Amino acid sequence: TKPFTLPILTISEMSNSRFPVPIDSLHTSPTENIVVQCQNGRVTLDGELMGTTQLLPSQICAFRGTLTRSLFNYYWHIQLDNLNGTPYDPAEDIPAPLGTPDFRGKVFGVASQRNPDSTTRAHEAKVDTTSGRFTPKLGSLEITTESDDFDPNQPTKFTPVGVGVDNEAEFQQWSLPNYSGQFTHNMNLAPAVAPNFPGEQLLFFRSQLPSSGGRSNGVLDCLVPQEWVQHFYQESAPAQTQVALVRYVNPDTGRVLFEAKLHKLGFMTIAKNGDSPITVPPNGYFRFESWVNPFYTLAPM
Amino acid sequence: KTKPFTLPILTISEMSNSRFPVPIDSLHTSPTENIVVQCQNGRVTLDGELMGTTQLLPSQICAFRGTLTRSTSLFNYYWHIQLDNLNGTPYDPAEDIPAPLGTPDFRGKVFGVASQRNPDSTTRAHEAKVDTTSGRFTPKLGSLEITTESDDFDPNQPTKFTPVGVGVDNEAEFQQWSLPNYSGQFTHNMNLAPAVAPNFPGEQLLFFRSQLPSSGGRSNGVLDCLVPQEWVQHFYQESAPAQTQVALVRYVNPDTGRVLFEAKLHKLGFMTIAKNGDSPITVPPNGYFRFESWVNPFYTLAPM
Amino acid sequence: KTKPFTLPILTISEMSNSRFPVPIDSLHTSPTENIVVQCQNGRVTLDGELMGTTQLLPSQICAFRGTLTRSLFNYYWHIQLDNLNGTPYDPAEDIPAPLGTPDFRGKVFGVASQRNPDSTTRAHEAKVDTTSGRFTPKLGSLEITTESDDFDPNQPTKFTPVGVGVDNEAEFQQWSLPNYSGQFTHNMNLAPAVAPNFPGEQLLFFRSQLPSSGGRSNGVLDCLVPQEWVQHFYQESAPAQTQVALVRYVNPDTGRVLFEAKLHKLGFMTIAKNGDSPITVPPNGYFRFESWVNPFYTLAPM
Amino acid sequence: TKPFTLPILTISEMSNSRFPVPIDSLHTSPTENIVVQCQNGRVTLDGELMGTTQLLPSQICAFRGTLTRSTLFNYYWHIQLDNLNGTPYDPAEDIPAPLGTPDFRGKVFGVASQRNPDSTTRAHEAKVDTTSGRFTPKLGSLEITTESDDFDPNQPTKFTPVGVGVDNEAEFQQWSLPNYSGQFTHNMNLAPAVAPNFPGEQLLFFRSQLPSSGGRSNGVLDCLVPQEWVQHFYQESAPAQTQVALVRYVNPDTGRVLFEAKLHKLGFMTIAKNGDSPITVPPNGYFRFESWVNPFYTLAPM
């Protein structure tokens, strides 16, 4: 039986599993009034990926495909391939192509092309996940660009940079988009998570994304960092119980700072009340202690 | 009871470039006798020691943070960047590294997006280029210069740079095997990771190759790394003791259950194969590298 | 007509040192054959061109502003330097270092102060070792040392210079310039060294005795020209008719001249005197421009 | 007849005339509910110093004198004050207090330093409480407070001002003159108070934000004219042809005029503005004299 382990990583050595950016802080909040069903960064403790989660850190909210013709007022239609470059099969039991953004808003980035004659071009672009032509489950999506310099029918890649909404309220990180437009409803979704113990809230790995304009704070929370996605997938260690007891330890000090539950479906809960950051020392790290049952009472923070 | 050395089980489509935040596109071998191979990113020993400017975060390779200002003296607008380490400290040049971790390790222009968020929460982001051959590219001294087409940048504001691809006009301006001058022309490069080369007849370096995006021109954007970023992270975590200077590795197809080729994974973090000429090494989509055994340096690899 | 050259009418007790924010204490002459006098603050041409790290504000000499981050005065702090603007200093300007940067080897003693966005404040004594390997002002940073640990990181910090803070006198070398870029590169864009170009002449200095936080340091600091002359020449920019302006120290009570001196175009004075000696002046006397002369003019001794 | 001129100075090239710090901004405000009578930085346009105003930028809120013992900043010390030039202070002089005495109520935070005949030196943080009953500089003495007990009695002592040192913001009152003679008598020989005298006009202030040793004090200090103007007018002594000089802030980058103001004979400015508000100026702009004018001039609103 292979033991369960966490990688030894510092707050500044973790990457967001819903975006190609580093983790900036730890955060907690009540979550009764939101649905926490993100589809990227979703993995079980025994290394089973769920939702649209994949392994490549740079490919979260990115895409590959072929461009066609349809202030960012130039509209382009993207026929989506898999991030392999292999053709995307909508019949596959997944909500959308792996790496598809799992929130409502506009993903700001750069679309680039390389033609057979070796000519190239790349310009800023936005992916509106709220538009009726955001149908990646059907195999296509729409980008908008400020530039007209794009050649139709050429292979196109998208590099995510941050959020590109105009008003803060258009970015809702806890509202899944319609992966099929309004043709049909979302399917094959990774389960939604919630704390299930009195006085416990979710613990989030928080990033602040770049913003192309407006006053969007670009706050994106993920349940588990991308390195844990990659680590559990490699290890595939059998989950002994539903809950893993984890502790944040300071190697400078020897002291433990707080304890937490790491649940089998891939999320963390702590004993705290209110929307608040969790300030941690620069050398601290999460450490696996043992398998424990859901009725464990954590020391409050 | 000696902790065994391992490679993560990753297919070709599951690896990331360690010199740029992009997926690996192919495997490639090439003669390098006439060139010096000394990249500074993606440099790790098999027992988990990072070298050069290598760090763990995949997105921070060729990215930077700091404070933007207008420079003292078609991408026209010039901006000066006082460089911060990732934690938000200013970069202290007294540290024994060639440059801030993740600083580009090639000659050319890095094309990306510079973004700002002001204390009153106003934001902006526009395309930008980092010329690593500019005389004001002195990251070791704590500064660099970006070029932009837009003028919408507030000075004295925190600024991030996300790298997307090459930005040179003429393909020959991108020299992936030519180091930049980390201190400009004021002093020489320091604390470099050592250069690598095959030390056996009939052997060539094996590269993990990516085709970076390009903002224009005919640049193929070819970037070779010695080792994927996932092996950098894995070896750092494992730190398994290196039994010898060479680890024998085999590329196995798990459906066939048969090895396609074998290679030497050297202790300093680079691979060699028994092959002559510049050529891609095509592999099945489910194949992956596997550690076979520690060997002596004079082990003879099967050809190809 | 041609705009005439003038000196401000100022008494000895109405002049400020141009290398430190203190009043001028006395006049002094000294043989300088075996040293290189090349100070960077208080460097101005007679026709109003500033040189070195010289600027106009008297309080900003050996002061600085920036952001403090962490790194018996035993607490070390990293200072990311800003211009008086608030924006980081650009190392690409053709100056030796940020304007006002100290131009001597030793420790500057002062007070570092902070004011945070929530309006909370703190201030404590600090020292600036201009010989430290981490004194890299030209690169945009330096290292302060404090006895108090009460300093918030990532907060705007000012430094008010008070005086010397060396332990033994020999650490203070007023005529030894620091390495503005640490040991990464050598000093550049320096104002030229100065020396008398005539037999029997010595440099004339405006001398101040800086406060000292401890030890036996005399705190002696000599500037070539007071800060008021820096500000005056910059405003007037009168054309220099020759390389030497004859200048006379006059007593307005008695109407008599006490001595004469050469005010050179590069911005320094020489007198016909031998040996290390103070120059005693009446409390109401002052320098006054007499005429432009040729370099081979012979000053009356003393 | 010598014409009246202003020095060509930028916002960032001006010093506060009530404290040895640079000017940070321009400000305006209604002043009906305060007495604007501040004694430092008081000069007439024809070059006459008033109040406790002197020439040296570093000596505002500073003192020289002899220290002796008397009775957290625990240690109390008595200062027998000399003049800033080391000359004995005469309380019969027709001035409010020794030149450079603070002209506000609060605590001046700085460093007291000593150098002894045997060349031993000390320097530590110190505060001058101008509201204390033993703050009697007109009588020739004040009291400092220190946290360090390392001071030698009967030794020459200097004081370098750094900023404010009150605990609560309300202790610092920049528009309340201290009692230069304690409560033994009232203030004498004061520079006159100023106020706008035209409809829609308010005073224009040169504003700095002083460092603070603690608490949440904003350390905001307003002066009527910058110290460089005090020095320039003293040098020029140009005849004031009328009571009001018309002055315009011009942008050399664009050649355009941004606002105009009245510069009054007693040394203060008024603008056509309403409400407490900063006056934002471009970095290269400067004040330019236009002509002499009468008090009934109507300024263009801002």
Author numbering:
A (entry chain A): 224 to 293, 308 to 538
B (entry chain C): 223 to 295, 308 to 538
C (entry chain D): 223 to 293, 308 to 538
D (entry chain B): 224 to 294, 308 to 538
Please quote the paper that reports this structure.
The crystal structure of the native GII.3 huNoV TV24 P protein was solved to 2.6 Å resolution, revealing P protein homodimers in the crystallographic asymmetric unit. The TV24 P dimer exhibits a typical NoV P dimer global structure. The two P proteins also share the small T-loop with an α-helix extruding out of the flat surface (Figure 6(C–F), Figure S3). All three P protein mutants with a single-residue mutation at the HBS wiped out the HBGA binding capability to all type O, A, B, and non-secretor saliva samples completely or nearly completely, indicating the requirements of the three amino acids individually for the structural and functional integrity of the TV24 HBS.
NoVs recognize specific glycan ligands as host attachment factors or receptors for infection. Genogroup II (GII) noroviruses consist of human noroviruses (huNoVs) that generally bind histo-blood group antigens (HBGAs) as host factors and three porcine norovirus (porNoV) genotypes (GII.11/18/19) that form a genetic lineage lacking HBGA-binding ability. In this study, we solved the P protein crystal structures of a GII.11 porNoV (VA34) that was isolated from pig caecum contents in 1997 in Japan and a close-related GII.3 huNoV (TV24) that was isolated in 1977 in the USA, representing one of the earliest huNoV isolates, focusing on their HBSs compared with the previously known ones.
